[PDB]
Write a sequence for this structure.
């Protein structure tokens, strides 16, 4: 490889949730929230 | 103890209303308070307090306001002087900076940024510091579900 | 601007303070009225 990282123009980080990291998160009570690049966030989920 | 009923006095920080001297009148004053235990709390290991069973709950809340007992002929003269547009109160933010966060990848050496084209009149300078992406919350959104750090 | 940083085995951010004059002038012309005019220079975020 040996390429300089990064050599492309870095656009600033958007100030909302779901861009900063694609890590696995957690809800307010502790339920595991799937990452932002997951395919389960194309809809919303409402609990009874 | 684990179980703490708290009684806290939370200061106002927004600079335009932080040192403001209100003249008489009826003013609404509304505010949103976080319940996020990774934001309202700080641990000495940095663990995820959402998973670790921490929970804050707001029972009641009050606004307090200490009034100087000024004389009613003096506080009517001061009210009349401070409503002239030449006597408008003027504040500055202490930081006084447009804040731009730029993501650096892992093991990345070079970080090029750009500001496209702008009038740079009354520019003061730069002050920069590298931060960690884990330790920074995504402010601006109402809740950051992906901020597993306290 | 172009920053050369030490490499880290972790995603990191870059926090730049573009120092401006973030100033508010507060006009209270009548009873129960607050009129505030905000201005920061250079990085003004006002459409007016």
């Amino acid at each position: 490889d040996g390429s300089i990282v990064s050599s492309y123009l870095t656009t600033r980080m958007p100030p909302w949730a779901g861009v900063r990291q694609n890590v696995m998160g957690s809800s307010i009570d502790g339920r595991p929230v799937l990452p932002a690049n997951s395919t389960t966030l194309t809809y919303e989920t409402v609990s009874g | 103890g684990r179980y703490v009923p708290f009684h806290i006095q939370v200061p106002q920080k927004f600079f335009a209303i932080k040192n403001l001297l209100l003249l008489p009148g009826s003013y609404t004053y509304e505010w949103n308070f976080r319940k996020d235990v990774n934001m309202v709390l700080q641990s000495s290991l940095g663990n995820d307090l959402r998973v670790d069973g921490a929970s804050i709950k707001f029972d009641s809340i009050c606004l307090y306001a200490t009034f100087f007992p000024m004389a009613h002929n003096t506080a009517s003269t001061l009210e009349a002087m401070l409503r002239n547009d030449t006597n408008d109160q003027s504040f500055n933010d202490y930081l006084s900076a447009a804040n731009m966060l730029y993501p650096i990848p892992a093991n990345a050496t070079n970080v090029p940024i750009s500001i496209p084209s702008r009038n740079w009149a009354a520019f003061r300078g730069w002050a920069f510091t590298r931060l960690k992406t884990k330790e920074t919350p995504s402010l601006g959104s109402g809740y950051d579900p992906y901020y597993t750090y306290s | 601007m172009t920053f050369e940083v030490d490499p880290m085995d972790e995603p990191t951010l870059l926090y730049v303070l573009f120092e401006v004059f973030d100033v508010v002038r507060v006009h209270r012309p009548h009873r129960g009225v607050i009129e505030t005019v905000y201005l920061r220079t250079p990085f003004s975020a006002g459409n007016a």
The interface with chain C takes residues 10, 13, 21 of chain A (CB under 8 Å). Chain A has no helices and two strands.
